[PDB]
Amino acid sequence: EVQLQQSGAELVKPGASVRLSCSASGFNIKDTYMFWVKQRPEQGLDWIGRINPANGISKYDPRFQGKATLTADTSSNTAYLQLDNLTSEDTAVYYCAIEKDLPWGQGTLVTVSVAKTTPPSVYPLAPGSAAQTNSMVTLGCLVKGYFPEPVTVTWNSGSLSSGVHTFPAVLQSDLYTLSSSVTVPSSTWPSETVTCNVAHPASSTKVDKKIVPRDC
């Protein structure tokens, strides 16, 4: 197929520099104009600058002139973006795109912080033995104490789709906390096995916790 693949998430001390990569599969970079878009968390889209990889000439927005540098090499067909003297103000998702009819890249997350990586701790949320002999039951999972972003929660290995809500993470002393709920009918629980599965890539940690009834 034809699509841009951007690089992985980054964790950097401030003042540090990064070099993000955007690959063109099934089409040639040299025939298009490529641009990069920045997006602060919860905020909107800022254009960083565009580039025509052929002649190597790039046009920036003055706000990024001394922070960003777009460079394109037609050989490996990869476009790049280098950020300098990182600061909290640069922690955001970066997008790669072509000036034509093609979907942009999935974007890259760059988290600038002194905080070291820390795997989450997932605690399973089982109810306190109350009348659960009613149509549908609501199970829960509370993932907390991890940094940086993002974690992933799925239910019963992605098979349980309908009824799940993973609420957005939130900082605390530089640590996140997130949680996910699922509504399985009363019958399936626990006549079947419902389990909360969470993957935090930044620490090569995955954790499975079996939602099981509370005792005595």
């Binding site: 800022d46 009819d101 109810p127 109350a130 509370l142 957005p168 906390t177």
Partner: protein, 211 residues
């Protein structure tokens, strides 16, 4: 450069309605404009380029127009999956700037929060922490208030609240409230109460466990 000025900032409309999002370029851009929809957590999707050309694979309900400095997105017969942000982007000259956006929520009939509360996991109690959680799933509108009444007494210390975005099919919301105490304190109190007050009933939804 040419500054895109977008309006309105926040918008609420129902299924079946016709909406219009307008973008006004400071300077003339001779139809060098494009519209996007950014759904939470996904890359901005292009809807229409060169002011009026609709992209292939995008519904006929999305009509684009404008001339000179005025341009506007038009959504005839709104559908539930139309919620998100819409950015009008210019590219007449450099720098190609983006408009401030439009948070488009979907008007739907009111619905009450179906709530549930969970005591702290056996596992957590040993770490020296206790998190009492409560999920108020599926309500509309978003305004809603829950108060943690510990032993019949209100506590507002160490409570984390989070909310999701409008569902794709039904347009509702969900919220998760978390009161985090130290193992010690959790052990010296009995009833824990997550009480929620919505706009669909006058008598507050209460869910609590005694421990």
């Amino acid at each position: 450069q040419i500054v895109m000025t977008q309006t309105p900032a926040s918008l609420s409309a129902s299924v079946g309605e016709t909406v219009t999002i307008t973008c006004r370029a400071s300077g003339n851009i001779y139809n060098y404009l494009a519209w996007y929809q950014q759904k939470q957590g996904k890359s901005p999707q292009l809807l229409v380029y060169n002011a009026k050309t609709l992209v292939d694979g995008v519904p006929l309900r999305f009509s684009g127009s404008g001339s000179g400095t005025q341009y506007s997105l038009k959504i005839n017969s709104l559908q539930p999956e139309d919620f998100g942000n819409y950015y009008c982007h210019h590219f007449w000259n450099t720098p190609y700037t983006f408009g401030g956006g439009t948070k488009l929520e979907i008007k739907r009939a009111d619905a009450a929060p179906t709530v549930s509360i969970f005591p702290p996991s056996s596992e957590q109690l040993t770490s020296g922490g206790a998190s009492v959680v409560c999920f108020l799933n599926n309500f509309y509108p978003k305004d809603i208030n829950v108060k943690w009444k510990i032993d019949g007494s209100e506590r507002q210390n160490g409570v984390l609240n989070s909310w999701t975005d409008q569902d794709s099919k039904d347009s509702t919301y969900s919220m998760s409230s978390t009161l985090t105490l130290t193992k010690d304190e959790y052990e010296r109190h009995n009833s824990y109460t997550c009480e929620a007050t919505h706009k669909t009933s006058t008598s507050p939804i209460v869910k609590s466990f005694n421990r």
